[PDB]
Amino acid sequence: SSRLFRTQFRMVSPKRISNPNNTGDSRNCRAGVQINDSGAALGYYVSEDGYPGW
Amino acid sequence: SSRLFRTQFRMVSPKRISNPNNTGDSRNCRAGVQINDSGAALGYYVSEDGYPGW
């Protein structure tokens, strides 16, 4: 893009954030959110928008 | 942390603080809160909490 500001924001629905490959919750990865040694988050796992079932 | 102030606080849920290994209650150490000879308290036994296992 060639505009004045190149910053943009996308709204993500909470349903998308899930563990990769639909596995269970490990100690350091609860509900698709990475957790460090303390309670703070480090990174998030985002699925892909699948409208068709396949 | 490299910020100006190094103080960090936390919120501890009251369920965490209990007697160690569920050992029966005592005189000085009641319900995971240690009591000195008078009524004052000196230290608190607090456990870690991981819901699935480990």
Added chain:
Amino acid sequence: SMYTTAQLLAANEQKFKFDPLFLRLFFRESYPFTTEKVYLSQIPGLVN
């Protein structure tokens, strides 16, 4: 009634080696279950 003197130098707790490697590596998620039985299912996955 006894006049002997003693001093204890060191006391050690000998222990055997133990490391749950198979649990550590593979079985990484745990599913606690309130009900009586657990079902594991499979699918053939073969399409001509």
